[PDB]
Amino acid sequence: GIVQQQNNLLRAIEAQQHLLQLTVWGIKQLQARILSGGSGGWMEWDREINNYTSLIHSLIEESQNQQEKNEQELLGGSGGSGIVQQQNNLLRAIEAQQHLLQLTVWGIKQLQARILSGGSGGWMEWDREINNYTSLIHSLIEESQNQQEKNEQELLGGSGGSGIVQQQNNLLRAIEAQQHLLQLTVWGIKQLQARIL
């Protein structure tokens, strides 16, 4: 069932969302030690972490509802549009999560620049890895946006069931890629915490 899958996709996004808050908590601690206020980018980061967390909370919340609704209709077997809506949802949630990764990455980049050499202890690989995964996810998001649009029209006429299945794959791979991204931001914070705390 694509519906059950989408539930796992939702659920995964939630876990990633907690994981993410853990890193913001992480970066906030370091930021306090290394830094003399919201000067030079930081109050905006602070404010934008929030403006995105809140948008994502609200997105998980809309997804959880589309989910229950999809589940209630598994025996009515007409609900192509609900599944496609759920896909739209998950896409929107993935991107916002991305914005959030991007802020944390920036956070760490700022902090590392002040206290470590970016050519030492695994930081060159880290940059490249970060940078690749970023470009990879951007590509998967782009492709997902492209796939959504298409599905949404395939759904008018006869079946476009392959494109739903395809899209599931799209979303699935963007989440694995954010998950790497996450691992890399955990690594970075772990290095900074080691050095300065």
Partner: protein
Amino acid sequence: XTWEAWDRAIAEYAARIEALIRAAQEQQEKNEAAL
């Protein structure tokens, strides 16, 4: 020692997420049996 039982939570969300992405791939690879 907040940082070790932080380090606890992350490694043990990280190990939820892998074994969901587990399920999602091992549904995906049912889906390619439509395709």
